Design a protein around this ligand. Sequence first.
Ligand SMILES: *[C@@H]1O[C@H](CO)[C@@H](O)[C@H](O)[C@H]1NC(C)=O
Ligand SMILES: *[C@@H]1O[C@H](CO)[C@@H](O)[C@H](O)[C@H]1NC(C)=O
Ligand SMILES: *[C@@H]1O[C@H](CO)[C@@H](O)[C@H](O)[C@H]1NC(C)=O
Lengths: 424, 424, 424
Amino acid sequence: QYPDPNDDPFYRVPANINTYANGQVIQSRSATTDIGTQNNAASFQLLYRTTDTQNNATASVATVWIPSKPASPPKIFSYQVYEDATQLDCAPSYNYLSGFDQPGKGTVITDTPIAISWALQQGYYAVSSDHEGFRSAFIAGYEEGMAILDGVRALKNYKSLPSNSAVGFYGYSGGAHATGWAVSLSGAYASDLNIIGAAYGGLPASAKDTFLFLNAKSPFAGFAIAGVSGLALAHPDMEAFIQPRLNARGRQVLQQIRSRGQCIGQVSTGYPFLDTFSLVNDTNLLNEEPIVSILKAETLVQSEAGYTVPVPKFPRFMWHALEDEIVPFQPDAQYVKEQCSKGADINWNIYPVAEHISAELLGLVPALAWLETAYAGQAPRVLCGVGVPVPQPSAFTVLGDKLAQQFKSLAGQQSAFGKTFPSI
Amino acid sequence: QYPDPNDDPFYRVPANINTYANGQVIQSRSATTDIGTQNNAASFQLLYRTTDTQNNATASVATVWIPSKPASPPKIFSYQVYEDATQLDCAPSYNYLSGFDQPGKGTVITDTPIAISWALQQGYYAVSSDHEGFRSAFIAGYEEGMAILDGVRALKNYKSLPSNSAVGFYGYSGGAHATGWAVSLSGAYASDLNIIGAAYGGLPASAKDTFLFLNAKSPFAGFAIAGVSGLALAHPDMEAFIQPRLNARGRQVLQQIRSRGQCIGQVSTGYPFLDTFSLVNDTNLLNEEPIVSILKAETLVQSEAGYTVPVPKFPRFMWHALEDEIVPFQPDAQYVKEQCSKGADINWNIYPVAEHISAELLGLVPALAWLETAYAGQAPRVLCGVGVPVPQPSAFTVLGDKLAQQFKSLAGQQSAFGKTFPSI
Amino acid sequence: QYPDPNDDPFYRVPANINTYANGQVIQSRSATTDIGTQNNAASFQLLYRTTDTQNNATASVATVWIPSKPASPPKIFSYQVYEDATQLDCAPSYNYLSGFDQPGKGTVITDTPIAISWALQQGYYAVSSDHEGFRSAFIAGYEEGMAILDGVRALKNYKSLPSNSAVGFYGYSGGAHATGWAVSLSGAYASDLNIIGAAYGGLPASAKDTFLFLNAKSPFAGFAIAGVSGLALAHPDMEAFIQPRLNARGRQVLQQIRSRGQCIGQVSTGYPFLDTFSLVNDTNLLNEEPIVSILKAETLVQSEAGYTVPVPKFPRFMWHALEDEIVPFQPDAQYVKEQCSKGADINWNIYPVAEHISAELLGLVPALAWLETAYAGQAPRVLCGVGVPVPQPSAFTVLGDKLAQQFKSLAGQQSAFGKTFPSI
Ligand SMILES: *[C@@H]1O[C@H](CO)[C@@H](O)[C@H](O)[C@H]1NC(C)=O
Ligand SMILES: *[C@@H]1O[C@H](CO)[C@@H](O)[C@H](O)[C@H]1NC(C)=O
Ligand SMILES: *[C@@H]1O[C@H](CO)[C@@H](O)[C@H](O)[C@H]1NC(C)=O
């Protein structure tokens, strides 16, 4: 329907970009999508204003879906696609369009149409932002987190949705990492968003870990470079550090991984068992500045982080393949523990017999079930941080109100042992 | 009531065996059994036609119990007893008979009469086949699997039961191994059977493994030799391989373990910590032909097998002692894991504080409770291959029909990562 | 409100102590407590007659709270405070009193009041016995077990509550340990008490283990000596043994750890990383008599004990911080396994992300929720000794009553494998 976004003027940041607020509509246009056609629910591409990794004011695009029989009070579903590619013609918005001549068409057609159809048939509003942006940086959380949040803001703006509108999130693999940074940032960057829940599995919580896991050792080592690419695309001084150190073979590989039509299918398989350190003159590159610091800002694991990782309280549903061969299980589990230790509300599901592929479907029907409850404000009180759902009773049920509030007010104070009571 | 089955003309393969179809009754006779008298349900021994480990046409017996007020629509319960002996006078049919002078009386008096009584009082048709056969081969799955399935067939024939009559399976320990092979073969050999569910714990999934565990290192080392015996009784080339390699001391042990009245009680207790390798010449005899091939054909663990292990879809309930001292937990754990990844429906229960005797009873009461759901077609949708039941919701619930069928067609296809969506 | 109990005449054992029965009230007096004022429930201090660690007849004090709208039929709640001190001015009764001039005020103000308040508003009679006694022995189970049980008797006596009155227990940490010995002893010492359930987490089942765990390697090393002190106060020959071996520094630590106002707060933080062995000449002395014999009686765990550890059958709810840094997790786990293997009824809940302080709160509201069920005689049938609740069905309903009695009959007898059916 539309061109390759490299040539579309829609995929350009206006000069007055700073006059736009964060999450504000710059301009709109109708879009015929497979997903909209199947649900009889109009879809539009929205050019909106967001922020980037250096707080320069930029823009991105997000496709939206308006259900023909909408739910009351309004509810919003935000699916985060796993682009997992460093090219603008692999962006969600373009590949959603009804049509067969877009390269990264595969990322939006496997499980995605079901979720988004689910949301729309539930009467919910659907939004999916090119969380990677015009930059198309991949695995950079700060750009992804703001872009997705503002994408929801933009959805509320475009349709004049109430400011208390309930907002739910889904996301697998890179879409999780998107969903998971949208939630870390959700506190500061978009406290106007009433986030009733965030369902996401296969989270690559720490970058450096996901790199070392795939680097030199998996047929998906292509993601190692696609990751480096996207971070250097979002951290310009890293680009400045990498470029003069790239060797002959290195320059071809980076140029290829950034070219047109180099989407998730090509990235996955195109560079199997490739050691990204071989592409570079220096293998000590991770320990060197600015790369070492950029990694430690681009992780959700607190024991690694160079910053204070926020701990969102709203309902979260999370899963992961124990046996994950692409996205490591150790960091995701670690993040869940750390967030639970500081009072998160994480329904944690571990799949013993699982593959990164197998878990994508395993987690879909539980998560979608879970989200419908969280829109009704009735996601199950379960034990945080257990591989399995464990249904704990309610304080305002068991104790009654005064005791419940007296019980809850213990958090922060000290037990008889000197150590301080945590959030419980 | 009857003579020793070795002397009984009933326990004989007729000469016209090939005129009979698989699961056709050759002749019947009254059996006055304790289980029948207890439940007010007439019982008969059915000599019926089956097939064996060399596809030559044979026979076996199965006792059946006809309830006084049978359930509608007809449902059939098939208990697999743990004979765990290589002797015809330890065969179930005989010891089921009212009387105290048969040697293998113990297997059908502990927990077994409760199981069959449950089914009969449920109004179900009850049958238990001498899964070991006239050969009384022990640990040979193929003879046991066919013998049981034909028992169900023959039970349907004897009573003119609808051909879609609902069929459930129970078995612990050697009865599990009986029941666990009846299910593998059920696909090819007995797709005529409406298999509504199969509850079985303490499975000796791998022959070789269950052997290695008991051999020379357990007070129940008798099951190691009783195993060797049972495979050689069903595999004549294994027989021919062992016979000249046995030493005098070995011949004594094999003659004894095969003698009259050497049933499960005498076998378990008769040979403590006995090293089967001393009894026969050549210590590498397991690695040598034809035994090595028979082992890798007589295992359900796909990583060992020399064949493609079937993965039945119908509802399954399975348990096991984590702390099991007779049947190793590792192979059964392995088998269950594997079948789930290829789309099995296995409700998995692991017992943390458990003993083989203790787990026999622990799992008995849930499994029967579970089967009654499975007879109503309502076995719990739970997460397959997880140690504890986790009720995951339904697709035709979460998605609705069109989204459900669209979701279901994902299995088999490719994700964006190249690898294939499994059965999920 | 009242003086330091060392100076109070109420805190004295009368000379005719032997005229009193076990659990008979010596005399009472009103107590104006913070908890009493808040719930509108009159409170009294009860001096009552109990037994001690050498079967010589003694006395202790226990506070009670009588609800203004009592539940019918009478029900009793027995909260066990985690005194964790070898000093009488740290006793529960005194610190309960409205007031701020008691040193060990903290143990009765955090989670303790919410537990009791729950109880009173539910209509239960509340009691909390100074389980350590006038001796204030800490970690000495036999004095704690008898003191708490008689505290319950004394309360039945004081108000003339019927002899089949339902009696429930709560206790975490040192209060659990007390709660845990009162349950072992419940059988012998108090078959008159109708104990409907006992919820307790973080149990230091082994004295010797909890000693080693904290000793010299944890900031709570004060509990090592506070434990040691508490035993030597209740085992006079241990006192006689340690006293001449104390070196200069040792006598200072022991006099101090016992002096006034050295309560749980003072012990907890006051002696971090202190080696008990450094204080007393003879590192081998813990291995030497009579401490080694005292420790074997002291450990609840059987694999350690020098006696037959009782396995009470009534419902128990138990938790424990897996990552517990104060009360080691393994001895509670070991204890639980053993009790379950011998037919106990322990509902076991393990906390994955946990610290001693956090598990205190995690488990409190589930336990109170649970106890409310057990007072209704309907604590959940779940799988014993498993980290998570697995709802096991009723044998009677599944098998049927006649079959269930036969299944009950099977326990104690022999299985077909020779070993004996356990209690299941
Ligand atoms: C090559 O690597 C060294 C360290 O191994 C690094 O200091 C240097 O800048 C690199 N040279 C370039 C620019 O290729
Ligand atoms: C004894 O075993 C050896 C191999 O170790 C074999 O060659 C020989 O034939 C055996 N003796 C028999 C089968 O009588
Ligand atoms: C030292 O230890 C010994 C043996 O344990 C004991 O007899 C003695 O009283 C202790 N006191 C000193 C300092 O001699």
